[PDB]
Amino acid sequence: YFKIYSKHTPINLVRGLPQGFSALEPLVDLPIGINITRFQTL
Amino acid sequence: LTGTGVLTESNKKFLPFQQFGRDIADTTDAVRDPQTLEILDITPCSFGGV
Amino acid sequence: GNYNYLYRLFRKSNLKPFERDISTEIYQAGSTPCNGVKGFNCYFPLQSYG
Numbered sequence: 001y002f003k004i005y006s007k008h009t010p011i012n013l014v015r016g017l018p019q020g021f022s023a024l025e026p027l028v029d030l031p032i033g034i035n036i037t038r039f040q041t042l
Numbered sequence: 043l044t045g046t047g048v049l050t051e052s053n054k055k056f057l058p059f060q061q062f063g064r065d066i067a068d069t070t071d072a073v074r075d076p077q078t079l080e081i082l083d084i085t086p087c088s089f090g091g092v
Numbered sequence: 093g094n095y096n097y098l099y100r101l102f103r104k105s106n107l108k109p110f111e112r113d114i115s116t117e118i119y120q121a122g123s124t125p126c127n128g129v130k131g132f133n134c135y136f137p138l139q140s141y142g
């Protein structure tokens with residue numbers, strides 16, 4: 001089971017992360033059922 | 043998810059992924075109707091010692 | 093002889109739940125290495141049902 005969580009937040013810090021609290025709301029439970037060990041982003 | 047209780051309108055708000063709400067003992071305190079997207083409180087109907 | 097059905101007779105490790113392995117890797121069933129070429133104690137992982 002490949003579950004996706006997410007949270008969109010308006011930020012205005014130039015370089016690094018802000019400091020605060022924001023919980024992530026699940027979006028998609030994607031039924032792929034495959035071995036995953038090494039991933040690559042775009 | 044079967045059960046028994048009094049169904050009343052709910053003042054709570056459910057996020058879109060949320061389908062039902064559990065209390066401390068994990069009994070369904072509030073439910074979302076699968077047909078009409080409206081939230082219902084499940085208060086258990088009155089019990090007492092006679 | 094309907095040899096259209098096959099099963100993985102030889103594998104090095106036990107599978108995880110809900111796992112599919114279509115890898116065509118040879119197995120080394122002896123001390124003599126196979127190195128991807130069949131020979132002595134080197135047999136195909138999948139064997140056809142007779």
Ligand SMILES: *[C@@H]1O[C@H](CO)[C@@H](O)[C@H](O)[C@H]1NC(C)=O
Pocket residue numbers: 076077078
């Ligand atoms: C059917 O159920 C969906 C919820 O999945 C709801 O949005 C829709 O209004 C319902 N339609 C009817 C005709 O009840």
